């Protein structure tokens, strides 16, 4: 739709500001290595020369420590047990994998963790026997809320010597919430308690795993057709290669840049240059992207070896230019869960504007509550609900025959694409701001809003919007490949 030279120029500019802002963040990290180390205890390792890692990101360090210690071995054991069951007892493989999932949960979280998972699953099943969507959702929400009760938290913490085990239990139960809610809502043979236990105690997704639809799980656990062993080894080899590449990329990002430590020190984030701010935002979003790429590629690889089709991994955040695409293609599993069980039951987007607003509000409110329900989470939810609603409204307005005819008559297709890129620039800026609120909280959001949109309205804002305009041209050009279908 655009000249090849023009799109090449936009791609060059996009890579340019990406890498230059990364370089600026690296320089700022080198300047304040001593201060950040004193204040946040940067870790020392030999992976990248004498560089020191930034371990201030809780999720990355938590899951890396767990994988070093126990989870990698348990995942390998699940892989081996699944292959052995396929070779020996294919018809009983779901139950062997259920048994292995329960045993691994016992190994990491002890008896209390398995007992809690079973209690939640049984309560959800019993409530689902009353085939009412409202009752099932109320039960799931109450079980989710129980995780945040101070007394329950104290009792749970008394079970484990270390805090990491308690956090692992909390994450496991948070994901089990989605899993057994999915099962119960689909329930409204093939939906019996053994199948629910197999679905819940499926190890690849036990801790932090993406929501895998029960329909696909049961359909693909009863297939009885499997790929040869050599094909499984080839798939495992390629998946491991890509996973190691992604893990190395995340470690390199944490070593070169200390985005997490800098975001922790608001006073520092308020005195860095504008290029450093942009680079910090890009590095934060891309580190989150690569982190969940690694955290879903292990479950995804295990499911692929098991013969399941896992939800698609997140798409490069440096190709996302809109709220709708961002939330369609980043967490595909959770997006599908929300579409089927939250968005559509409350009318989706087929009951006028107000219905669409209400459905989006319910979806984002549930997502924020699931993530913890903190004030910054609610803020993120409000911002993203507003962004998605505005995008849907503009899309509908343009889709009207009158507006479409006027645009075709007045503006050339190149002009239309340029206008689309200009709008997507502001959309991307707001999306980045909301996701920075998510990652760094309200202080980071206030800092970015003031230093980019208030204290730098004349030229900082226009520079950011021009760079995001080039970025959005490049993102729409790429989205033509997949977004069309």
């Amino acid at each position: 739709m655009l000249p090849r030279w023009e799109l090449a120029l936009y791609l060059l500019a996009s890579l340019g500001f990406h890498f230059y802002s990364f370089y600026e963040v690296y320089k700022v990290s080198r300047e304040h290595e001593e201060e950040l180390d004193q204040e946040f205890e940067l870790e020392t390792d030999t992976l990248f020369g004498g560089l020191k890692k930034d371990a201030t990101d809780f999720e990355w360090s938590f899951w890396m420590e767990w994988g070093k210690q126990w989870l990698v071995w348990l995942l390998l054991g699940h892989m081996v047990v699944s292959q052995m069951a396929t070779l020996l007892a294919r018809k009983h493989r779901p139950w062997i994998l259920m048994l292995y999932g329960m045993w691994a949960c016992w190994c990491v979280l002890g008896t209390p963790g398995v007992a809690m998972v079973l209690l939640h699953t049984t309560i959800s099943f019993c409530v689902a026997q009353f085939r009412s969507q409202l009752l099932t959702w109320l039960c799931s929400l109450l079980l989710l809320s129980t995780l945040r009760l101070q007394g329950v938290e104290e009792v749970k913490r008394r079970w484990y010597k270390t805090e990491n085990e308690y956090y692992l239990l909390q994450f496991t139960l948070t994901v089990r919430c989605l899993y057994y809610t999915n099962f119960s809502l689909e329930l409204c043979t093939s939906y019996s308690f053994p199948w629910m236990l197999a679905y819940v105690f499926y190890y690849p997704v036990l801790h932090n795993g993406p929501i895998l639809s029960f329909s696909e799980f049961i359909k693909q656990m009863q297939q009885q057709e499997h790929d040869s062993l050599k094909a499984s080894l080839c798939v495992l080899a390629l998946g491991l290669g890509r996973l190691l590449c992604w893990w190395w990329l995340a470690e390199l990002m944490a070593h070169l840049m200390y985005m997490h430590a800098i975001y922790s020190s608001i006073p520092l984030l308020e005195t860095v240059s504008c290029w450093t701010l942009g680079g910090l935002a890009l590095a934060q979003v891309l580190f989150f992207y690569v982190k969940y790429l690694v955290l879903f590629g292990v479950p995804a690889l295990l499911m692929r070896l098991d013969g399941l089709t896992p939800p698609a991994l997140p798409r490069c955040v440096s190709t996302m230019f809109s709220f709708t695409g961002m939330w369609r293609y980043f967490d595909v599993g959770l997006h599908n869960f929300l579409i089927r069980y939250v968005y559509i039951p409350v009318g989706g987007s087929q009951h006028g504007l107000l219905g669409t607003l209400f459905s989006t509000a319910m979806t984002f409110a549930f997502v924020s509550y699931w993530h913890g329900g903190y004030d910054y989470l609610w803020c993120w939810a409000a911002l993203n609900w507003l962004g998605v609603t505005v995008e849907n409204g503009v899309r509908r307005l343009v889709e009207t025959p009158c507006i479409q005819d006027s645009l075709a008559r007045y503006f050339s297709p190149q002009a239309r694409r340029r206008f689309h890129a200009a709008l997507a620039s502001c959309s991307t800026s707001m999306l980045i701001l909301s996701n920075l609120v998510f990652l760094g909280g309200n202080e980071v959001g206030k800092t970015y809003w003031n230093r980019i949109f208030i204290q730098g309205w004349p030229w900082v804002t226009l520079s950011v919007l021009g760079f995001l305009y080039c970025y959005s041209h490049v993102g729409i050009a790429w989205a033509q490949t997949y977004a069309t279908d």
Partner: nanobody
Amino acid sequence: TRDKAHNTESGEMLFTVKKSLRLSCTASGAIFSTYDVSWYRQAPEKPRELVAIITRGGNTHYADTVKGRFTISRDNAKKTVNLQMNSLKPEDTAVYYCHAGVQGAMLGPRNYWGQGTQVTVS
């Protein structure tokens, strides 16, 4: 006048010297620079209510009922949080809870509550 509420029987003018209260909350085994420390109070037969909060960026907020009277500060070096309570009134009698909580998905689900300390006045 010369009343028993004004002076002693000898004839010396009475006056009540009122003292302030300064709660403290030291955090151990944490990266104290990343927490939005806060002070809650739970008066008897009432729910716990936020008294003050100082975010990791230093931004400070106070409950409307303690604005100006109470002052909250943090010392990242000493890893302590202090609530300087002045002009105490009987309504301030409650159990005061120190709270430490990070804000932002990068920092994780760090949410810690103090055991609580009793503050009584009048």
